[PDB]
Amino acid sequence: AVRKARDAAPFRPLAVEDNRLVANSFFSQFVPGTESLERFLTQLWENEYFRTFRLRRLVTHQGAEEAIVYSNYTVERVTLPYLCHILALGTLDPVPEAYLQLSFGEIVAAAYDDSKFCRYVELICSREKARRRQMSR
Amino acid sequence: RTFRLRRLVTHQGAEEAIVYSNYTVERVTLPYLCHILALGTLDPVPEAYLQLSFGEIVAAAYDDSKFCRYVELICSREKARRRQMSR
Amino acid sequence: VIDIFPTGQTMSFLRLLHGFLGTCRGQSMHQVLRDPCVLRKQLLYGVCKTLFDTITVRRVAEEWKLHAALFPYRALDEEDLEQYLLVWSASLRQSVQTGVLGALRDILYQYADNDDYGLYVDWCVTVGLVPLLDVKTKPSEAAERAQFVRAAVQRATETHPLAQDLLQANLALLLQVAERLGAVRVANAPEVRVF
Amino acid sequence: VCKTLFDTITVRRVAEEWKLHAALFPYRALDEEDLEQYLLVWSASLRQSV
Amino acid sequence: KKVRSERLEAQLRGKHIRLYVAAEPLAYERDKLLFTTPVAHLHEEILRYD
């Protein structure tokens, strides 16, 4: 294979006819630094999208970043205008930010506490216990 | 330094999203309200109340309005009318 | 006679606001205040502070008695009523929460243009001499505002019998904001100049 | 949709469910203790089923 | 994009069709548009990368 490479890229010289044999030569080994500003463009995207839409990050001890979630601001800024002029208008409320991270099954429990139905079952538990509290006296 | 936008930094100094201050919302947003839009009625939102949800902001102004202090009066007045019936 | 806007300085002064020639890592620092839908969150608080301040005791005290005598019979004067009142507070707050929520999410996003503010914050940080446009208001221009305030009642009646009365009480502010806010613009015109 | 879905319901529909379920099988034993405990479980057992 | 009574229309199959503005362009001096979108901010630099 080494031999194959040796003859696979043959020794091709370089020459230009000149009236006279005058030649003063230099050489430029070079690369460009693509790593130095990729790590600027990657932290450009992240420093752009966190200013347009302000996406929440969850960082732990020793500063380790985890998955990045929507805010309460961006869901209002890009999803709600999809709801007000592309979808049905004037009935749907925007979800909180922590509830957006929360499960699809648990959202009905999180809106159950946010509805009247917890405050109905607190009403029925306190009113029918009160009719049976005064039953002792 | 112009508009003094507040940053949210956490433990081991990690920067999070950057919010408006209470200063800039009166300096750049509010003259657009009081000289371009309708005048002389609106109040500037607090800075921490700007990060907060679009739904619970009216509940945060509910505590700042009279209706908590009316529902406390009604819950203390009609409890007081039913306190002296025992004695 | 001094031209300001369409000169050799101010054209590149605005092309540099976006990424036409130079871009560093912090040109998006302008973007975090270039965004709209913060003015909406400001005028929401600017109207909702007024919205809960035009109501007296007598209107809402009668709600207590109607709700109290609609179904429950007091069992304990100092216990059943105190607990009932305690839940009753949040159950009126949440219902008038969703009531004013239905009353406001419909009217903001129909009437507030989004980028009439971002063009503003692309001007005030840039020149400080922001031009502004108006419009003569035909009855067709005020008709949909007069019908959509009538459509604001149906989104509030089903969650609250009072929030209808509150919007009926506070209709004056909603007609005041729906006649100036969409009446003014900021011109992105091709052939414009400040003098 | 679920915020609107849990807000157009009155007391009178769900309070009749209480009495029906209460008398469906159990017999009240203690007015101040048995009923409260019954009530306590009765909250989550309707919340999970809805 | 219209220049006489300036407007934003959309075309499909030789027919008009609904669109809406969400990041509408900075129409300025002559025969040119400027875009306040986030991607045009780094459009040249991401072409600078390749």
Side-chain angles (χ1 to χ4, degrees), chain A, chain B, chain C residues 1-114 117-195, chain D, chain E:
Chain A
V2 169
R3 177 288 306 274
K4 177 63 175 66
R6 180 290 191 274
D7 302 276
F11 175 46
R12 296 229 298 129
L14 284 307
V16 290
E17 176 279 348
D18 195 351
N19 176 2
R20 283 275 144 79
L21 46 96
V22 178
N24 293 79
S25 167
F26 297 104
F27 169 67
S28 61
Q29 194 78 335
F30 186 74
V31 65
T34 71
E35 61 261 23
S36 47
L37 66 99
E38 177 273 346
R39 70 166 190 161
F40 146 77
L41 290 160
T42 283
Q43 75 160 112
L44 183 53
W45 279 100
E46 281 281 332
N47 206 31
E48 283 153 339
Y49 274 58
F50 287 175
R51 269 90 164 95
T52 72
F53 303 137
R54 313 186 215 154
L55 320 171
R56 179 74 36 187
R57 331 178 75 171
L58 303 285
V59 159
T60 182
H61 274 220
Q62 217 200 10
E65 51 92 18
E66 311 206 310
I68 284 176
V69 74
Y70 275 165
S71 69
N72 260 345
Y73 172 65
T74 179
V75 299
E76 191 265 348
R77 202 207 155 173
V78 306
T79 80
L80 200 159
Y82 181 76
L83 262 292
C84 76
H85 288 332
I86 312 305
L87 297 196
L89 76 168
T91 170
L92 291 82
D93 197 85
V95 58
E97 45 191 37
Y99 280 175
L100 193 143
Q101 194 261 348
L102 174 148
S103 176
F104 190 79
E106 303 253 20
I107 179 173
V108 190
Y112 199 78
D113 266 358
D114 202 8
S115 171
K116 306 152 54 199
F117 263 70
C118 55
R119 261 177 326 271
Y120 274 5
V121 74
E122 191 35 64
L123 181 130
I124 298 189
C125 83
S126 42
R127 205 257 197 194
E128 275 81 3
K129 90 181 197 80
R131 192 51 198 91
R132 307 277 86 80
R133 186 164 65 247
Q134 80 161 5
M135 205 51 213
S136 44
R137 68 197 74 90
Chain B
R1 268 90 163 97
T2 66
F3 308 136
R4 310 184 205 159
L5 322 170
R6 180 76 33 189
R7 314 181 88 178
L8 311 170
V9 180
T10 183
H11 271 228
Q12 200 142 336
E15 49 94 21
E16 291 206 349
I18 288 174
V19 76
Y20 275 171
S21 86
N22 270 341
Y23 173 67
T24 188
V25 295
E26 330 161 351
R27 194 192 165 177
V28 302
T29 78
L30 178 139
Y32 178 77
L33 315 173
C34 59
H35 277 319
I36 314 297
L37 298 200
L39 82 157
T41 166
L42 302 94
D43 193 273
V45 58
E47 44 192 35
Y49 278 0
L50 198 145
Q51 191 264 353
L52 193 143
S53 90
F54 191 72
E56 170 45 61
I57 180 63
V58 75
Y62 198 73
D63 263 348
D64 305 335
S65 44
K66 302 157 60 199
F67 275 84
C68 51
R69 279 182 314 274
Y70 282 152
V71 74
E72 188 48 50
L73 173 135
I74 297 189
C75 83
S76 44
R77 204 256 200 196
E78 276 81 3
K79 91 180 200 71
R81 191 54 205 91
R82 304 279 88 81
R83 185 168 67 246
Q84 81 163 7
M85 204 57 205
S86 45
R87 72 193 68 86
Chain C
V1 71
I2 286 296
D3 195 20
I4 289 186
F5 164 73
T7 188
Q9 210 287 328
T10 310
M11 49 189 51
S12 56
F13 202 104
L14 61 62
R15 308 298 306 277
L16 266 295
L17 185 138
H18 312 108
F20 190 36
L21 305 182
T23 316
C24 82
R25 206 173 66 246
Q27 199 153 354
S28 83
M29 295 327 116
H30 162 90
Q31 193 47 240
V32 79
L33 62 152
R34 197 250 170 257
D35 49 38
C37 317
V38 183
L39 75 159
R40 295 210 165 89
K41 285 197 182 68
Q42 152 67 22
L43 64 94
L44 200 71
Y45 180 86
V47 66
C48 74
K49 176 152 287 164
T50 307
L51 270 191
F52 295 157
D53 276 5
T54 79
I55 304 101
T56 180
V57 177
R58 189 176 57 84
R59 176 58 190 87
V60 289
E62 210 170 16
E63 295 293 300
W64 171 81
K65 173 180 55 59
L66 310 174
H67 158 85
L70 251 174
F71 171 89
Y73 307 92
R74 59 174 180 85
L76 279 81
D77 52 356
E78 183 176 2
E79 287 304 2
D80 176 4
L81 299 178
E82 181 291 331
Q83 293 300 3
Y84 210 95
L85 276 175
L86 184 55
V87 39
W88 188 74
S89 43
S91 56
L92 61 71
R93 176 197 290 198
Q94 279 277 345
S95 43
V96 82
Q97 185 203 340
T98 69
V100 67
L101 257 47
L104 62 86
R105 201 192 69 79
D106 46 359
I107 49 174
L108 258 56
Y109 290 91
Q110 191 184 9
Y111 190 66
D113 172 86
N114 47 10
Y117 171 73
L119 210 150
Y120 158 74
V121 295
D122 282 335
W123 268 84
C124 53
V125 80
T126 290
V127 180
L129 291 283
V130 190
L132 67 162
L133 301 200
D134 315 308
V135 55
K136 178 70 89 172
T137 315
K138 270 313 155 193
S140 59
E141 311 186 19
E144 74 287 31
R145 297 305 117 183
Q147 284 106 27
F148 202 71
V149 293
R150 291 295 170 271
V153 70
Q154 65 99 8
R155 294 162 171 91
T157 41
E158 328 302 314
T159 173
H160 219 268
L162 171 148
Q164 166 190 341
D165 285 331
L166 197 149
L167 64 90
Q168 186 64 256
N170 299 340
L171 199 50
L173 45 86
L174 178 48
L175 61 95
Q176 270 170 355
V177 295
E179 292 330 294
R180 289 292 96 188
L181 275 43
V184 70
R185 284 300 173 219
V186 54
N188 51 4
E191 182 49 279
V192 76
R193 48 181 181 173
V194 51
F195 203 74
Chain D
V1 76
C2 61
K3 171 167 272 163
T4 304
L5 202 44
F6 289 168
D7 268 3
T8 79
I9 307 94
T10 175
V11 176
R12 192 180 50 83
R13 174 60 182 86
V14 64
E16 206 173 21
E17 294 294 292
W18 170 80
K19 183 283 295 187
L20 303 163
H21 167 85
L24 250 175
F25 179 93
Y27 303 95
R28 60 165 184 82
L30 196 33
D31 52 358
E32 170 188 355
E33 292 312 353
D34 182 20
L35 304 185
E36 180 290 332
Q37 294 299 1
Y38 264 158
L39 260 172
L40 180 58
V41 65
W42 193 79
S43 56
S45 47
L46 58 73
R47 183 197 298 200
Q48 286 280 344
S49 57
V50 80
Chain E
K1 166 68 166 277
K2 303 202 150 33
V3 296
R4 203 67 141 86
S5 51
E6 54 94 12
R7 271 300 204 193
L8 274 303
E9 298 286 326
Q11 283 284 260
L12 173 78
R13 264 74 184 263
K15 270 286 172 191
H16 280 245
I17 187 62
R18 181 166 74 257
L19 83 168
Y20 83 105
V21 282
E24 57 257 39
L26 296 93
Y28 273 99
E29 49 264 49
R30 278 169 75 94
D31 297 332
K32 57 181 321 180
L33 274 298
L34 186 43
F35 295 87
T36 181
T37 174
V39 283
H41 296 173
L42 81 169
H43 165 70
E44 200 278 335
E45 296 68 59
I46 61 167
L47 292 158
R48 177 164 205 262
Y49 201 44
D50 34 327

